[PDB]
Design a protein around this ligand. Sequence first.
Ligand code: PEF
Length: 185
Amino acid sequence: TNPYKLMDEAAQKTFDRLKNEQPQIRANPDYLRTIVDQELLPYVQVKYAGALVLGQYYKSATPAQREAYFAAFREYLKQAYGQALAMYHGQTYQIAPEQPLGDKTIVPIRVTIIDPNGRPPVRLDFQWRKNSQTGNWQAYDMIAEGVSMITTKQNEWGTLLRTKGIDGLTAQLKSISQQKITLEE
Ligand SMILES: CCCCCCCCCCCCCCCC(=O)OC[C@H](COP(=O)(O)OCCN)OC(=O)CCCCCCCCCCCCCCC
C-alpha cells in the first residue's frame, strides 16, 4: 500500500467511470456521488479531514455530535466532489512520478488535470499520511492550485462554528448534501 500506486488507481478508476458511464450520470447526476464513494473515499482519511476542519471545536463535541458530524461530512464529500466531477468534458490526468518514501509520514502527490484543447492545467496536490497504527496511506487534504481545501473550509465554516458549534456545521453539511448535483450541457 504505497501512495503513488493508490493515487494512480483512484485516478484511473474515476476517469474510466467518467468516460464510460455518461448514460448513468445523465440519467441521474447524483450517480457521481457513487463514483466518489466507490473510487475515491476508500483512500480518504474521512474522520481525520473532518476533525482537521473542526480544529478547536473537536475537543468540545460529544461522541454523538462527532459521529453525526462525520456522517454529514462523508455525505458532503460525495456531494461536493460529485459536483466537481460534473465538470468532466474529456480531461486526462498525469501523476507526479514515484519518489522513494524513506521514513516520511506525509507525502504530497500532484495530479495534473489536462484539458484536451490545451487550455490551462489544474494542479491538485493530494496530501497522504502514513496511518500510525496500520501503516496504510490515505489522502487527508487537496491543495488546489496553491490552496489547502481543509484550510479553505476552516476559514469558511469558522463563524458557523463560533456561532452554532458542531451541530450548526453538521446541519449545514446535511443541507448542502441535499442539493441535487447539476450538469453543464
Ligand atoms: C484523483 C482524481 C481526481 C478527479 C478529477 C476529475 C476531473 C474532472 C474535471 C474537474 C476538474 C477537477 C478540479 C475541480 C476544481 C476544484 O478543485 O474544485 C473542486 C472543489 C472546490 O470548488 P468549489 O468552489 O465548488 O468549493 C466549494 C465546494 N463545497 O473542491 C471540493 O470538492 C471541496 C471539498 C473538499 C473538502 C475538504 C477536503 C478533504 C480532502 C480529502 C481528499 C479527498 C480526495 C482524495 C482522493 C484520493
